[PDB]
Amino acid sequence: VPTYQYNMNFEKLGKCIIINNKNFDKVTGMGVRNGTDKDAEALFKCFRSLGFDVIVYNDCSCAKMQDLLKKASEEDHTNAACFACILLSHGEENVIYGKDGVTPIKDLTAHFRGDRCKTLLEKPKLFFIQACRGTELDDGIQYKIPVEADFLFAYSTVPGYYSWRSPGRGSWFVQALCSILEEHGKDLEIMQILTRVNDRVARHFESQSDDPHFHEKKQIPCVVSMLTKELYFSQ
């Protein structure tokens, strides 16, 4: 009263995992996510600027993704300030597509509970998810600590909705997120950043297909926070 920031005084800001799924198996019938490569390239340079050690894995299967995050939580994070994961794929509420079929997000993040990844205790664990969480469209108008503590989920959309994307400019959430980080990534606290992000995708974007049933639609991101302190990317 006051109270404040997460300790950022470490050799490393932290590791960042970017899973970019563009092509899926015929079995699933899901379409190619053209423009996601443009999203991933943008995310790559931004999180690098912040100070993350970015790594991009392409078209992963459910096992790959599961195993990929499992090992991450097994690495030693003592010299890291935080951890970040960016998921780029098709998805359905509570789920993200892999090249295979489908995987519950809960299991991806689960590996970081405070009792399953001790080098990350009392440290922020960030997950940015760019995926659908349903198919609806927004049509328009006018001491001891909780193993579940210190997580942050920045979903590109609200539960049950579709997540928009430009084949040329990339997905809406990503495009907007990278713009705010580029201008304030090292100036505002996470919630301020993710808030300005919500404002852009909400005001500065509006769909536009020839088919009428998807015209002039809108989208609003969903930020889910279990963070216990303010987070800045600049000691």
Binding site: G29, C132, S166, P167, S207, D210
Partner: peptide, 17 residues
């Protein structure tokens, strides 16, 4: 079954703008 759903469930719908 509606084609307008085919695209969405297969995530083919895009912003074309």
């Amino acid at each position: 079954e509606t084609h307008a759903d085919y695209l969405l469930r297969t995530g083919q719908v895009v912003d074309i703008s």
